[PDB]
Amino acid sequence: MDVRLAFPLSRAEEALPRLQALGLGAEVYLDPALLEEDALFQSLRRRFSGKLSVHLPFWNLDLLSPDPEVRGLTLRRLLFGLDRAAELGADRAVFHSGIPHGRTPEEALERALPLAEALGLVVRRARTLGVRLLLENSHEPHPEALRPVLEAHAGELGFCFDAAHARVFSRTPDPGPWLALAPEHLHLNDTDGVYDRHWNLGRGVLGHGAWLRPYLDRTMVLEVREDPEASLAFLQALAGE
């Protein structure tokens, strides 16, 4: 199994020893404040070899923001993040759609093709660099608003499924409709069904045993804020039956 630990670049020193010890890959979140810090990228690239992907910046970003300066910043953040991903030898880079929380299905759907268009330069940059670009669900109420973005890009854009985001932020809490988008990348954790807890698998309400087994051959990222061993042990028991 390709199982990776999520951590911010800002906590790499702290997460690396634990990665080694558990034989995990990495998905590194590119702290916007740290994007220009050449030495941190050099240090990481030397100190880790093993499968690596990145989470592109996302906080307060949206390619379709009504604020033109936010749109500009968002584009710069995604493109620079992709440069850094390539430097770290990342296979994949994950990003959010930028959709605000609480849009209606109609509002989310209307953003789909404008988003596909706005992603033109980002998809092109990823292609040039040899980095696979993945869109993750966040606040979309239903997977139908992501489907046209994927289709417009005709296989050049992949999907990362985060089940907790569907459960706590969307109007489609069941994993089924989201799984129908064929995620190649899974963001794994558990939640109480109220907050995006980033707890270990087995600790919450998502019932991964009921739906996750078919996806164990895909890249899985433990997006867990506590020690991730319990999730790795969950995955291993799931894999053995």
Which residues of this protein are in contact with Zn ion, per CB under 5 A? 136, 162, 187, 196
State the nearest-atom distance from the C-beta of 42 to Zn ion, in Å. 25
139 labelled ligand-binding: no
Across the chain, the runs of DSSP E, i.e. the strands, are 3-8, 25-29, 52-55, 92-96, 132-136, 158-162, 185-188, 219-222
State the nearest-atom distance from the C-beta of 41 to Zn ion, in Å. 20
Which residues, listed in sequence order, are joined to residue 110 by a DSSP beta bridge?
Answer: none
Instruction: Provide the residue count of the chain.
Output: 241
State the nearest-atom distance from the C-beta of 46 to Zn ion, in Å. 27
**CA–CA dist 100, 108 (Å, integer):** 9
Nearest to Zn ion of 62, 162 (CB atom):
162
223 labelled ligand-binding: yes
62 labelled ligand-binding: no
The H or E element containing residue 46 is helix 38-47
Nearest to Zn ion of 46, 101 (CB atom):
101
- Token pair 């092109």 in the structure block, residue: 124
State the nearest-atom distance from the C-beta of 231 to Zn ion, in Å. 14
196 labelled ligand-binding: yes
Cα–Cα distances in angstroms (integers) from residue 206 to residues 168, 175, 230, in the given order = 10, 9, 15
Nearest to Zn ion of 43, 64 (CB atom):
64
Nearest to Zn ion of 111, 185 (CB atom):
185
Nearest to Zn ion of 136, 190 (CB atom):
136
217 labelled ligand-binding: no
142 labelled ligand-binding: no
The phi-psi region of residue 190 (left if phi > 0; otherwise alpha if psi is between -120 and 50; otherwise beta) is beta
**What's the first-to-final CA gap in the chain, in angstroms?**
14
Burial class (CB in 10 A: 0-12, 13-18, 19+), 152: middle
Nearest to Zn ion of 111, 139 (CB atom):
139
State the nearest-atom distance from the C-beta of 168 to Zn ion, in Å. 9
153 labelled ligand-binding: no
State the nearest-atom distance from the C-beta of 125 to Zn ion, in Å. 19
Pairing between β-strand 3-8 and β-strand 92-96 as defined by DSSP bridges: unpaired
- Residues contributing to the annotated binding site for Zn(2+): 55, 96, 136, 162, 165, 187, 196, 198, 223
- Residues contributing to the annotated binding site: 55, 96, 136, 162, 165, 187, 196, 198, 223
